[PDB]
Design a protein around this ligand. Structure first.
Ligand SMILES: [Ca+2]
Lengths: 332, 332
């Protein structure tokens, strides 16, 4: 099966757009692909973190991924810092990465401007660690955010350069583009996607958000002033109403035409009530599952320990090959 | 006992100046200090290495240190790459090192942007790995040559920055103060210290050099034109004669004044022949011992295995405290 590597920032925060758009689809693909989910705590610390929050959020992310349906027997899920081979490969790959490839990175320049008080070497060097993360597992495909395209291209270039020097040691990874999930946009500006760091909290619904707040947000979602009220799909002219239909469709699996038939003669209030009920229901169930996992420390420890063992057993094969190629005396 | 950490490049090429200065003093102090010797193969690959030669030179280095008297039951001797904790701590310390600090450690202020863009990231980032190597062992003292002073100052600055944020996790390391004494000087320029990198090989005697070559280079050593020719120690006016007396004294243990009396009435040719006999004898013996270790593959493995296990046991205590302070979920 193709090997898919996804890195998750330790946050606990996932928008519904993220879930229904992507993660929820990936959860259904665990039999057809060899999926590896890595909670990237080593990357988080390129910005200063509160130590208690970092630990807490690591566990929050794990419990959330488990609640969403990532199955630790079918997939490999682990915390990055629990697998030494990441940091080991990252150092080695530094030596096959050009300083210029790192200095020209858009993200480095952008984050340098925003974190001007903490331009540390980790902020500069983290694309190398990202490359290590991916290349360690003989990864075929990586789901890439728009802002991560340049980082994926560096991974491919490093892998290619290393293979040209030493033989086929790494796989050249490709973008993971699975079939479209649900379309979900911001509730007060439906021309833009949801973003977890939006200053307008009424735009965004997160998976662990109090259902009562989620319902309020949906009930005040932007709709048009058409007279009479017409529940019909048209992104250009009726973006707000269209987005409510797309969100409901994403929850129930009903088609846009089916929903338009179902809502013939109805008010925008009725459409919003329907969306609020469907989303609240889905989120309340997910949150009960999250709580069951999140409160079970022994289960979380077992999953992390087992995940890290699974990951290390794959990673060590690749690192041994890298170290062999470079010329190091193998550990006895 | 204070903890002393020394990093050794995988070379096999040490001069008699290294041996009679640094290494031999360090051998005889394995009882007063808790000494750690790290063959720094991860640092070596910041410059391109022929793989077979790197592996060979790593073993050469180990066998040479054993031949010289480094005792793996009194001291901890190991290969850097065998201890994952070095790379793990290095990534973490990247995040507490300023890009500005590494930039000022390079030649960039003197050099073009093309030059800077074309170096590998390992060459830029190695001062952090060096900091990690030292700090991982609660090191009190580090033997630093003049060219490594900036590097030790950065280590101290990182350690203090980290401790200021998180508590007293690291010892602040200090320079190791070597025994006051004469340095072995170059044979054709006795006003200059004997150096590995000298392009005039007649200046240098290496520990593993053919004893015929050693004898030739000593018999041709530069001496003064005093008339009458007097075998007396005076570094200012008789640098070459003085250097020969220093080298002989280093081999036989005889004080300089004992040697001045011994050579009363003798010609410089006599002194040179005596120095050559004594050094040739010493290196011949050293080389016999070196071959004994170097051809014993099972012993080298045993030494590497035990050394890495001793190092890892210590490194893991410190890495665990660093991770705990940062806020990572502890290794499950
Ligand atoms: Ca004198």
């Amino acid at each position: 099966k193709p090997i898919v590597f996804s890195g998750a920032q330790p946050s606990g925060e996932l928008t519904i757009g993220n879930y229904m758009g992507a993660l929820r689809q990936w959860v259904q693909m665990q039999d057809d692909y060899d999926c590896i989910y890595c909670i990237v705590d080593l990357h988080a610390i390129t910005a200063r973190q509160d130590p208690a929050l970092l630990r807490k959020r690591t566990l929050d992310t794990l419990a959330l991924y488990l609640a969403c349906g990532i199955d630790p027997k079918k997939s490999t899920i682990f915390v990055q810092s629990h697998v030494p081979e990441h940091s080991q490969l990252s150092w080695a790959l530094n030596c096959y990465t050009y300083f210029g490839e790192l200095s020209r990175m858009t993200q480095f320049k952008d984050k340098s401007a925003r974190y001007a008080e903490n331009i540390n070497a980790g902020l500069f060097d983290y694309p190398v660690l990202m490359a290590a993360d991916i290349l360690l597992y003989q990864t075929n495909q990586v789901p890439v955010g728009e802002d991560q395209k340049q980082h994926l291209e560096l991974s491919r270039d490093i892998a290619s350069r290393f293979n040209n020097l030493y033989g086929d040691i790494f796989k050249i990874p490709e973008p993971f583009i699975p079939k479209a999930g649900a379309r979900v946009m911001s509730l007060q500006d439906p021309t833009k996607k949801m973003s977890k760091s939006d200053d307008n909290r009424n735009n965004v619904i997160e998976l662990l958000e109090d259902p009562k707040s989620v319902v309020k947000k949906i009930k005040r979602a932007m709709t048009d002033s058409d007279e009479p009220a017409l529940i019909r799909y048209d992104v250009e002219k009726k973006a707000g109403v269209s987005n409510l239909l797309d969100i409901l469709s994403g929850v129930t699996g009903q088609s846009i035409p089916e929903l338009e038939a179902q809502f013939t003669g109805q008010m925008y209030g009725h459409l919003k009530g329907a969306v609020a009920d469907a989303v609240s229901g889905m989120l309340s169930e997910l949150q009960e599952r999250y709580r069951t996992y999140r409160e079970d420390e022994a289960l979380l420890q077992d999953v992390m320990r087992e995940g890290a063992a699974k990951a290390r057993a794959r990673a060590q094969v690749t690192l041994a090959k890298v170290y062999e190629a470079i010329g190091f005396v193998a550990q006895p």
